[PDB]
Symmetry: D2
Subunit: 188 residues, 4 copies
């Protein structure tokens, strides 16, 4: 299976560079103190097994899984739902990649209960031969959404429970709105 691992080399690289780039955004507020809209950033390559599986599901020819948009992904975590908008601004203003696609599951959460902002970028990768472009999916979401989705994604490992899970999601969504509301201590 060296075949695919050789294929994923530029995806690994793309992710590592984007980790350093985005993890450093936060670092900019670190010497003006303030409040940073970014709490932390994670990154990952879809494991080969998952890549072939999803390509069948959405019926993609092995010759064109490049068009699969989340072989490489990064995840940005914020405190408040209004930070997501701010982070959006940045990623759009950036010109070391270019935004290609977007899916707002914060406005219209999924039937599962799932909430996140997904923006797919086109990352220009420098290689020994020339210049490749790989699709990276960045996912922006609050800690609350991240709490919900991390547990739900795991359960991967019954209809009564799909419902309780959807209930839990919105419970969590209210706890979001409540902290943002609480943030009205700005009255100082």
């Amino acid at each position: 299976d060296k075949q695919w691992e050789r294929f994923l080399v530029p995806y690994r690289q793309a992710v590592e560079e984007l980790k350093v780039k985005l993890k450093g955004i936060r670092t900019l507020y670190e010497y003006e103190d303030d409040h940073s809209p970014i709490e932390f950033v994670t990154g990952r390559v879809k494991p080969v097994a998952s890549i072939l599986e999803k390509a069948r599901r959405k019926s993609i020819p092995l010759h064109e899984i490049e068009t699969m948009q989340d072989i490489a992904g990064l995840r940005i975590m914020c405190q408040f739902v209004d930070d997501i908008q701010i982070v959006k601004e940045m990623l759009f203003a950036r010109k070391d990649f270019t935004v290609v696609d977007q899916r707002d599951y914060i406005a219209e959460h999924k039937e599962s209960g799932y909430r996140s902002y997904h923006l797919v970028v086109l990352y220009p990768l420098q290689t020994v031969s020339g210049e490749k472009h790989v699709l990276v999916e960045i996912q922006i979401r609050t800690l609350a959404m991240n709490f919900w989705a991390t547990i739900e994604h795991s359960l991967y490992k019954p209809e009564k429970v799909k419902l309780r899970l959807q209930r839990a999601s919105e419970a969590a969504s209210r706890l979001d709105e409540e902290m943002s509301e609480i943030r009205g201590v700005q009255e100082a």
Copy 2:
């Protein structure tokens, strides 16, 4: 402060080592692939400013701030409260260090609402002199408690000044219930 810097180097070394060690557990659960009892591992050394400040408001003579327990600290993050217990039992079993204090604020949350399991270890550090020991506070919490704690902590960090506080209190309670509901949903899927 070049003097301070020499004081904090062992603590930084201690965070870095434990960081790598504890991500060993996560790393290991990726193979034998069930859900890892550790989601994230972070670590920080207290900034000199906060070291002096925490010192002031607890007496602690500036020649005895080695007794301050959280100069070095790691935070461990778990999906489930069940996962915390596993992580707790792993730490007590380790030979690379020694537990010397624990404060269970999951059982009895603080007045502010804060929940977390706090474990204090004595970490041995090889040096150029001989062998140094340092106190490192390991904090364990769920994604849900981590959500509350991060947000409440930041708000407090702007000075800290009423009815807001009681809403924060209830907020912790909501999160606890979300935690409980997810545990129930878990054993429900056993079936």
Copy 3:
């Protein structure tokens, strides 16, 4: 002095980024599994101390310290001198920055015998406040040159000033070193 670390934020950032970008070049050879022209890659942000010194020397006003070429630097270590050309061409082809200066102290060694290939680049750091370009110096060396340069530098960190019997020579050291590389290149040549 808290002004300095805020000043240096974009410098470490840029260094961190080129570090990951360059190590990736190496990585593109553990799969190809042939010879990689890059063995190691390091980076530094000049200490405030060194920055201040270098400012007076080069005659750089402190409010335009930005014009200093190596506040941020990276260093790439190669096996053979020929590897240095392969990396030079690679760097010149990259479009995530642009080359603005080069100094070939390999062909024309410095007085004290220091050898290396320096190229200075203009790096496009994205930030919240828009963009920003930083001058980053990339040094390129063989292991052999690296050996000499490291040691000489550590010595030159004794009062700066230094005897002329230790000055009987490290150039001779450096010429010896230069000949080792010469030899190693030749030896390699024997492939048959």
Copy 4:
């Protein structure tokens, strides 16, 4: 297959941990106001291919490869040959592992020209199952040795005249090392 991926997990972990432990040693000198005996530190685990070919060469029966001493290896580089003694002491004085073997190829340098000090330690990895011990081979060398060792290791790709030029290249490096420390001595007298 995956029975290997599982085998190497304690080795990759022990490497990651020692990497952090040893890199930290130089950091003790960033405010020591002295010179650090460690310049840098590298780490690797042996890729399965390499592991197999070695055991099917040194004639090691598979079912006990965990006797093979360098499945996990770190490597310490120094400026001077005097540093190597110093680091060596530290390593011996450490309590987070025990030294169990040693090969001084600086003292007695191998037909090829190979010079470096090899230290073998038993590392007590805390695992979930308990406490595993794993053999890790630490290699200490000067930059000079490293320049030579690195190039020669890669020439993996033979003429008896070439083997000899290489031998003399090792010597050349060794002298240049000695000249360096010599130069270093004269510097101290000032």
